[PDB]
């Protein structure tokens, strides 16, 4: 077989330059848990809808119940 | 119907509900931006001088001034004149809008209250709320305290001390220029 | 091809930004400017001695000759200061291994210095868009008798 090896100088140098997924497999850095591609795309659209912040519209929610 | 009252100097506002027509009949055939007396409105206000300038319609049609008529005329709006917030820079949009002169079609009336009268009510003329944001620039901080040049700055600054629980660390503005 | 009258319009015509000095005293009166066309051509003295102005003339005007230099025989002559050069040529047909003959005409503007008739060869040079169809100007009339 024929690999493709990279021998860095030190540990602090090899941590930053190498891609994140390569650090996971050997067990150097932590695995970055993130949200699914669908739901965070929905969050972008729903965040855009309300001009915002959530304070002003939430205070109206109490007033809208009386109507 | 509802009256949006707001005192400018003190800084307190309240909605007064009016089911009776006779009280609102003073505002019939009166235009946006004129002085109105308090005595003819009702028993609550006597000695006051109201200031009608704005309004609101049933369904949801904010009133614009300079339009004339007692009608709902659709108008062409853009950046520079109110009743439209543009999203694209330069884009226009034809919006619906309520006319100027008041009739029996409204839900809320806009009112500023200049001069006091007799019956000071609960928390509209009694209470006085301070303004939230202090000065900032070089000549705004100078004129507020009446300092002129030689008195210098780095002295008259508001440091609000907020507490999470144990600590009491200071905040501070940033005097630009 | 009017011609001869010098001035006969509603307006008046002079060469732009060339001035006749009123106080100075010389035989000229009419102050003429004329240009060298280039590309190894020869400007005639009928243009220099003449009285015509013309915006669209290459000798006395802003029309600069550049690009291509076509040729051909003249056909049509019957309008004010233009000409139609008929340029004949052959076209190939690979299937039969033969040649064709094709036609299309070329319109051009004439300087009043040159004297033109029907059935004479005319060398012609490309220039600014003079008009709708006319994109060319006359530079020679070598009518061998």
């Amino acid at each position: 077989s024929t690999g493709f090896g990279l021998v860095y100088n030190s540990v602090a140098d090899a941590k930053k330059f190498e891609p994140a997924y390569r650090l996971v497999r050997y067990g150097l850095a932590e695995k970055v848990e993130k949200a699914s591609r669908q739901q965070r795309k929905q969050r972008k659209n729903r965040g855009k809808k309300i001009f915002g912040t959530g304070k002003s519209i939430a205070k109206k929610a109490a007033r809208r119940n009386a109507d | 119907m509802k009256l949006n009252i707001s005192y400018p100097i003190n800084g307190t506002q309240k909605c007064i509900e009016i089911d009776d027509e006779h009280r609102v009949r003073v505002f019939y055939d009166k235009r946006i931006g004129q002085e109105v007396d308090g005595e003819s409105v009702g028993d609550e206000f006597k000695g006051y001088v109201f200031k009608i300038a704005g309004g609101n319609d049933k369904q949801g049609f904010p009133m614009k001034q300079g339009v004339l008529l007692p009608t709902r005329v659709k108008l062409l709006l853009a950046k520079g004149h109110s009743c439209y917030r543009p999203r694209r820079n330069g884009e226009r949009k034809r919006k619906s809008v309520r006319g100027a002169i008041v009739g029996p079609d409204l839900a809320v009336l806009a009112l500023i209250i200049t001069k006091k009268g007799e019956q000071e009510i609960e928390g509209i003329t009694n209470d006085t709320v301070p303004k939230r944001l202090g000065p900032k620039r070089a000549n705004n901080i100078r004129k507020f305290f009446g300092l002129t040049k030689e008195d210098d700055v780095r002295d008259y600054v508001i440091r609000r001390e907020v507490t999470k629980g144990d600590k009491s660390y200071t905040k501070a503005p940033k005097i630009q220029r | 091809s009017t011609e001869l009258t010098v001035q006969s319009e509603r307006a008046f015509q002079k060469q732009p930004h060339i001035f006749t000095n009123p106080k100075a005293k010389a035989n000229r009166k009419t102050k003429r400017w004329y240009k060298n066309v280039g590309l190894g051509f020869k400007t005639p003295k009928t243009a220099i001695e003449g009285s015509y102005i013309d915006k669209k003339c290459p000798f006395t005007g802003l029309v600069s000759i550049r690009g291509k230099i076509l040729t051909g025989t003249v056909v049509s002559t019957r309008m004010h200061r233009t000409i139609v050069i008929r340029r004949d040529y052959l076209h190939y047909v690979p299937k039969y291994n033969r040649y064709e003959k094709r036609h299309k005409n070329v319109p051009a503007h004439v300087s009043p210095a040159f004297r033109v008739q029907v059935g004479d060869i005319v060398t012609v040079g490309q220039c600014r868009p003079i008009s709708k169809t006319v994109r060319f100007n006359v530079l020679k009339v070598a009518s061998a008798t």
Partner: protein
């Protein structure tokens, strides 16, 4: 229609980049600069595919930020700067200096220059024009404009530049019996000594050119670039020396030249 174009499909890109057919849909568009789209060479191609330090375009962006690339003295952190002919590319780490000179085939060559000689750049003219306050200023064909030239410098005449400071040092005149490089068309990356010049009346000038082997070839004027006295090169040239050989001559060399 509608404004500029900010993409380049890989088959539509010029061939002397030497990019792969597979392993990518798009190619790197070189941005605006002192060199044209066809004649330039972007820094992604130079670092990734030529020198072969970085494996992909990701790692080229890491090198530029920390931070030793120097095209014509100054840094440039842009990934796709149009670096072209006679441009000096230095590296403080490794102590390497380069110059983009054309190969006998037509490609850009990886030519390792001395420390040392990488210091002056050679450019062409161009104009030859007066500015305001009657100031005479010269333009370079390879990018820049320089002020206050010598009174006898004209079109197609090459000029040496200081690079670090940015001023004129010396000039060479375009006349017969002098070395000249070619940077356009089919006879690209060849060197020769000149014989004749057909001037013509507004229809492109031509030049007849020999070489050390006495083989003749003809090219256009705008492609030609002067490079010193005959048998006296101002700049260091790579192996080959712009000779250009026959098909059968090159077959003879490779199978003969062996030694494992």
């Amino acid at each position: 229609a509608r404004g500029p174009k900010k993409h380049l499909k890989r088959l539509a890109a010029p061939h002397h980049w030497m990019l792969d057919k597979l392993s990518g849909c798009y190619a790197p568009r070189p941005s605006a600069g002192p060199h044209k789209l066809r004649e330039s060479l972007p820094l992604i191609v130079f670092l990734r595919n030529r020198l072969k330090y970085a494996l992909n375009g990701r790692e080229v962006k890491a090198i530029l930020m920390q931070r030793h690339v120097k095209v014509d003295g100054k840094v440039r952190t842009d990934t796709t700067f149009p670096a072209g002919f006679m441009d000096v590319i230095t590296l403080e780490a490794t102590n390497e200096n380069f110059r983009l000179v054309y190969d006998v085939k037509g490609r850009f060559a990886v030519h390792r220059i001395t420390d040392e000689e990488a210091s002056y750049k050679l450019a062409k003219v161009k104009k030859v024009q007066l500015g305001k306050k009657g100031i005479p200023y010269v333009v370079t064909h390879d990018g820049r404009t320089i002020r206050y030239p010598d009174p006898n410098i004209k079109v197609n005449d090459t000029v040496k530049v200081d690079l670090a400071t940015g001023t004129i040092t010396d000039f060479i005149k375009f006349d017969t019996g002098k070395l000249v490089y070619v940077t356009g068309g089919r006879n690209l990356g060849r060197v020769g000594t000149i014989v004749h010049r057909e001037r013509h009346e507004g229809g492109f000038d031509l030049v007849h050119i020999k070489d050390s082997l006495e083989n003749t070839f003809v090219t256009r004027l705008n492609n030609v670039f002067v490079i010193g006295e005959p048998g006296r090169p101002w700049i260091s040239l790579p192996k080959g020396k712009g000779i250009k050989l026959t098909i059968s001559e090159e077959r003879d060399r490779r199978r003969a030249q062996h030694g494992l």
